[PDB]
Amino acid sequence: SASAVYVLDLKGKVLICRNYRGDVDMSEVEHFMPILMEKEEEGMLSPILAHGGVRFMWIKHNNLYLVATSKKNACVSLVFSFLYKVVQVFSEYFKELEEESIRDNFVIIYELLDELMDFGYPQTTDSKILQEYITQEAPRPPATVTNAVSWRSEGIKYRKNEVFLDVIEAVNLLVSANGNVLRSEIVGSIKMRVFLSGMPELRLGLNDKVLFDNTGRGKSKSVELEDVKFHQCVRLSRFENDRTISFIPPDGEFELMSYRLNTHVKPLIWIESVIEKHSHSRIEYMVKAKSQFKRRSTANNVEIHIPVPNDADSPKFKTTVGSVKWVPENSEIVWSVKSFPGGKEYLMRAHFGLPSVEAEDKEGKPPISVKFEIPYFTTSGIQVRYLKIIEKSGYQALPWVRYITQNGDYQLRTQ
């Protein structure tokens, strides 16, 4: 229940503001910057600010803080969801999130803000629906918003019905400094870019453990996702009733389902780090990486970031496979590898000097994270059964999907 949502800037200048209820004066935004500065200087800065009896919730954007001032005890979750929807709409409409587009599309920005929500209650949130009624370069509102199916616009015609799926896998491993993995969770991502004619209703079917158990086929490799979140077009009633994933696919790229379950398997890459740091004399980087993934799978664009000393200089790298580059801005050496086949063993030997004068304050031990991304690999073993594409007119669809495995929160605790 934010009184007014405004877009700020890095210098504190409000790029654009639009009051929704009028219960909060527009002058409260000026005091938001000093409050944020005081909180940052004292560590008390929070996204949800509080200017007396009015709370100015702000979200750190790419170039400006999306401050949404509120007066009463409005739904914080609802305000956050509205801000996220507005950010997504802006990203869809404007490819750049900076001050360049804030002052360049104000004429359409004001109309979009007015149409998005009224009296603090959001009304329009579909990017396609908003673009079909508000454009930067007006007819009556589309019937899709008024109709029940607000995620699949009717009347779409395409020469061919091709849908591109993406089996995105996020391998997050939390290995402590003792060598034991604490947080090992893999979050699935079923994103499909449906581009066909009409408004077909997708009939999702995969090798789900729950579905296999219900159908009596709970003996093969079935993916048991601890948390599965359906898309907006996905009907929750069918999923709750018999796990039937029946919903109208969106027009374009959309996230239908997102699996999320813990992983009890060994990490795809086993990295052993050695720190032979002398007392203000030299430093040793005994980094050894072992590929625990299948040999048939190669990790493309693997970048194992090893945090080097903050004041370290004149470093020498003695590695075997993969180029190592030290970035002064990042204050660490990333073990960049173009192609890393499964089972590969890369050994590195860092050697650099240190300044004679010791540091005045400690800098901490940031965890070592890798940027491995091996596609065409299904670590979870979940196999899609079929995709029920049904249209009233009747057409033969040719859906496509690719399985991509990448490294997410694969951070290794430093010694």
Partner: protein
Amino acid sequence: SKSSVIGWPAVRERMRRAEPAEEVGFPVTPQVPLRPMTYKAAVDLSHFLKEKGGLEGLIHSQRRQDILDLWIYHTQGYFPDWQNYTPGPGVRYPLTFGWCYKLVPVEDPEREVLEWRFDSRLAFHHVARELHPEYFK
């Protein structure tokens, strides 16, 4: 299917070698379609197995069934889930409609000896579906 005919003798030899009673990861072939075996495809596979032999009368085993399913998936891309047997005790009808292969006793259900037997009526009569309507949805 020349590839299927070639793989049938090796699969039969591997099944015979395995008694009736190391690499991690899940690599996927690029561009290879994956879908469950159809009723017509299951019937054709059962007929081919019956004609070539080595499937009817063989002792049913978990290792042999897994090897056969893996060979079928490698040769045609069909998921190794349609080669299921009906719940016991007794003769286990095919889980997927259209399958011409079923497991029947040859003498706890696990300790009972099962043997693969051809069944033409299985492809036309949903015995497994009738026995377990809940499993068939």
